[PDB]
Design a protein around this ligand. Structure first.
Ligand SMILES: *[C@@H]1O[C@H](CO)[C@@H](O[C@@H]2O[C@H](CO)[C@@H](O[C@@H]3O[C@H](CO[C@H]4O[C@H](CO)[C@@H](O)[C@H](O)[C@@H]4O)[C@@H](O)[C@H](O[C@H]4O[C@H](CO)[C@@H](O)[C@H](O)[C@@H]4O)[C@@H]3O)[C@H](O)[C@H]2NC(C)=O)[C@H](O)[C@H]1NC(C)=O
Ligand SMILES: *[C@@H]1O[C@H](CO)[C@@H](O[C@@H]2O[C@H](CO)[C@@H](O)[C@H](O)[C@H]2NC(C)=O)[C@H](O)[C@H]1NC(C)=O
Ligand code: NAG
Ligand code: NAG
Ligand code: NAG
Lengths: 210, 422, 152, 51
């Protein structure tokens, strides 16, 4: 979150690691989000400078470049190691980068280069904020984000008032196919979207207030 | 041209016939001289010597005798005591040294004029580790024979750190072939999965002493490390129900390969009758096969270089040979389809770490290929066969009464819960 | 013309001088351990380094006096399995749990290794290094949290 | 019953092994009780389970 190289010009969304190129501190859990304005075949061109720790299996100190604007996405690769990765094509309109770290490591980090060429050729993202608001499942139907007759996958970000915490409570909750998580569920991913911090995944009849 | 001269250093039997290594070297030189389409205007000459295989001073004299007489390569004295002594001679004079048996590479030895053809145990000890995971083992009992066998299987000793195994390393007795004090402890300790690291001449002697004990039933499973398991007599063991998985690099399915082996045992009329051994008839072992390939791989290099004048080099007057710097390169980027599959060499060292194994196993018809190992791929095993007629493990009255049932309160209704009940 | 050869002191080149001293008859006095090949009939060599068919008993008596059950032998090069071979064979006849590891090739960076030894809860280690490199591990085991009263 | 005069009890000893038959009361002469024990050793019927 102290990831202070980002620079975000129209083409050239050029970001690098926290404290690049000196080091990076332990317990850093950076969530480079990368909005990715619609064009350009999202480009992860890396520097040769690379010490994202060579652990086994990349079990720790890894570089999730999971292909989503979220966490549960098609994964590209856990890039830990010594030799630097290069040039992920990734025809999505998005890229999610989770730079993580353990407690007892060394590092220098990485650097990233943006902007390949081609055309722009579900996308709910109901960014809600402030005080008490309402989250409705019918917002995808009222605001034409999807059409009736296809699979839906929305994202309801609930960014708090400054210096706060969030208490979700369920007014209405009714699933079309109850007790079955492979065809409908509601998940309450906190912090940012990643498979690790999954607070609750409701697909049964009752949703308890997290 | 002046024709060529290959060197050679082999074992010195006293009264018996020639060894399997030296006879294969003599056979491979003659075979290339017959068939002209390899080396069309070049024939070969050999200058074989005999040493004691445990005396590195005798191996150093006979190497300098061939270098002073003038040779083009040295085809290995084939033992860890004396192969390191000839390797440093061939490095100093510049001539290539072609090895046909495994040797402990000391990790800080800067040598560049050696090349090995035995399959390196940084690849065979992965293939055994892929094979003790395909069989879903948890408690292996690696049995080696001499202290060098911990260097060979070192990717298998280090395995329980990164996987879920339980190594329980043992050792055969010194030189006595009496593993019966050992096999009592393996039987009392309930040790059913064994990874013997013997040569084939002594893997026969254990199986007689594992049959004289009650360790040849369908509970016991024995992976071997040696590559001459196909030349092992298995007729007493075949109906026991045991599992004896091995490996095999000697590609005995190509008809060109099988034609040479038929020519081998025909020309080897000096094969002694030996029923008390436990081996089959005269087969080309993988020790003699890798000497047959070693003449052919170097012959590819002399084909691509008709500028090679064999000079006479004195060990006392230290001077590197002229053409050997280019000629060592032409061996390392040489490809040949010999008897042991594809031959390629690893450009960093000069070892074979890329080769094609055939996982063989013991079924009631003998030793049958059941898989294929390859360092790029892994165990691409054939693995789906029937053989013996089938059985059944389910029956009637376990049918489970599909009860069609609508939901309506209070009669039938879903439980109010949060976790996915199913 | 000499009376003895006091050893070139390395496994590659001590075996080459041993067979010379056997052939000429002069004694060859060795001062560092060397892998004796089991079928080598030599009679004019004598070693003064304490043989690892006795040091590897002394470590095995010392991992039983301390009542250990899970040791984590760390060697450095492939010869170190020949040296500690009475300790590798030990869980067959006693109640131990060997979990053999290896330091990296020549780089003195055991920090990818010591992370796995720390996550795996491995408190009892039987390092097989020289003293010049047993110092370099202890600096890298102090820079990590592996120098408290739990570790032995 | 053993086969007629042929000393090949290996079709018999497969059925005794699949049928889990560990206790056998052979009624042979000694000249042919030797020939069964060779064919019971070539199969896996000579461990501490069999009596
Ligand atoms: C000979 O030439 C070879 C290549 O031609 C050089 O490479 C050595 O040999 C193999 C190459 O495959 C290596 O062993 C294999 O390592 C693979 C992973 O490599 C990297 O892994 C991590 C990064 O995640 C790093 O820490 C590591 O250093 C490597 O960078 C594994 O995937 C392999 O797994 C085996 O099992 C799988 C089962 O999933 C199967 O697919 C195969 O059976 C596969 O073989 C295996 O572990 C080896 O590490 C390479 N290096 C060394 C130093 O040996 C050699 O360097 C060269 N020389 C020699 C002597 O071999
Ligand atoms: C282990 O040995 C058993 C025999 O004890 C093998 O099992 C038979 O394999 C054949 C292969 O064609 C099948 O047709 C049979 O049905 C199997 N069972 C029996 C009872 O005969 C088994 O294949 C061996 N395992 C390996 C890996 O080789
Ligand atoms: C000669 O070698 C070639 C290999 O190129 C082979 O196809 C051919 O059968 C050989 N002929 C004889 C007579 O050995
Ligand atoms: C065969 O002979 C010709 C002329 O005699 C020579 O030029 C050539 O190098 C020889 N070797 C071949 C074709 O390999
Ligand atoms: C393995 O070899 C067989 C050859 O019969 C081939 O069909 C198959 O594609 C290979 N690969 C795998 C992964 O099975």
């Amino acid at each position: 979150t102290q990831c202070g190289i980002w620079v975000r010009t129209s083409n050239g969304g050029h970001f690098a690691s926290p404290n690049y190129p000196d080091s990076y501190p332990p317990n850093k859990e950076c969530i480079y989000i990368l909005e990715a304005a619609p064009r350009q075949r999202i480009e992860l061109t890396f520097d040769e400078r690379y010490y994202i720790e060579p652990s086994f299996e990349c079990r720790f100190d890894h570089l999730e470049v999971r292909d989503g604007p979220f966490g549960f996405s098609p994964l590209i690769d856990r890039y830990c190691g010594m030799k630097s990765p290069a040039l992920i094509r990734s025809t999505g309109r998005f890229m999610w980068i989770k730079f993580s770290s353990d407690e007892e490591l060394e590092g220098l980090g990485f650097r990233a280069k943006y902007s390949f060429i081609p055309d722009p050729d579900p996308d709910c993202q109901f960014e809600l904020s402030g005080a008490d608001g309402i989250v409705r499942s019918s917002q995808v139907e009222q605001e034409e984000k999807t059409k009736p007759g296809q699979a839906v996958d929305c994202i309801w970000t609930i960014k708090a008032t400054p210096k706060a915490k969030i208490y979700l409570r369920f007014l209405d909750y009714q699933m079309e196919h109850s007790n079955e998580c492979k065809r409908n569920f509601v998940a309450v991913y906190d912090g940012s979207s990643a498979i690790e911090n999954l607070k609750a995944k409701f697909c049964s009849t009752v949703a308890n207030d997290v | 041209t002046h024709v060529l001269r290959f060197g050679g250093i082999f074992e010195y039997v006293e009264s018996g016939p020639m060894g399997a290594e030296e006879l294969a070297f003599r056979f491979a030189v003659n075979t290339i001289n017959r068939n002209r389409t390899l080396l069309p205007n070049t024939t070969l000459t050999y200058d074989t010597q005999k040493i004691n295989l445990y005396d590195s001073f005798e191996a150093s004299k006979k190497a300098c005798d061939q270098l002073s007489l003038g040779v083009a390569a040295i085809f290995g004295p084939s033992h860890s005591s004396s192969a390191n002594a000839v390797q440093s001679i061939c490095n100093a004079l510049g001539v290539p040294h072609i090895q046909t048996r495994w040797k402990h590479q000391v990790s800080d030895n800067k040598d560049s004029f050696y090349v090995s053809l035995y399959p390196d145990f940084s690849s065979l000890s992965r293939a055994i580790l892929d094979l003790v995971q395909f069989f879903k083992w948890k408690t292996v009992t690696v049995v080696y024979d001499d202290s060098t066998g911990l260097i060979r299987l070192q990717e298998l000793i280090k395995a329980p750190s990164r996987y879920n195994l339980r190594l329980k390393i043992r050792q055969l007795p010194a030189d006595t072939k009496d593993a019966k004090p050992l096999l009592k402890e393996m039987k009392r300790g309930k040790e059913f999965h064994v990874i013997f690291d013997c040569s084939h001449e002594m893997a026969a002697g254990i199986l007689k002493q594992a049959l004289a004990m009650g360790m040849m039933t369908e509970y016991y499973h024995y992976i071997f490390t040696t590559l001459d398991l196909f030349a092992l007599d298995v007729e007493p063991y075949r109906y026991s129900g045991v599992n004896m998985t091995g490996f095999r690099i000697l590609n005995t399915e190509n008809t060109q390969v099988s034609s040479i082996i038929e020519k081998w045992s025909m020309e080897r009329l000096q094969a002694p009758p030996k029923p008390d051994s436990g081996l089959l008839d005269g087969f080309m072992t993988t020790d003699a096969a890798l000497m047959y390939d070693a003449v052919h791989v170097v012959s590819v290099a002399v084909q691509q270089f008709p500028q090679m004048t064999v000079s006479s080099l004195q060990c006392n007057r230290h001077k590197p040979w002229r053409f050997g710097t280019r000629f060592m390169s032409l061996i390392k980027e040489a490809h040949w389809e010999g008897l042991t599959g594809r031959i390629t060499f690893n450009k960093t060292n000069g070892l074979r770490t890329d080769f094609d194994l055939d996982v063989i196993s013991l079924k009631e018809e003998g030793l049958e290929k059941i898989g294929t190992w390859d360092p790029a791929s892994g165990l691409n095993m054939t693995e789906s066969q029937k053989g013996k007629p089938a059985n059944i493990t389910d029956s009637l009255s376990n049918r489970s009464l599909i009860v069609t049932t609508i939901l309506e309160e209070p009669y039938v209704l879903f439980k109010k819960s949060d976790k996915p009940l199913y």
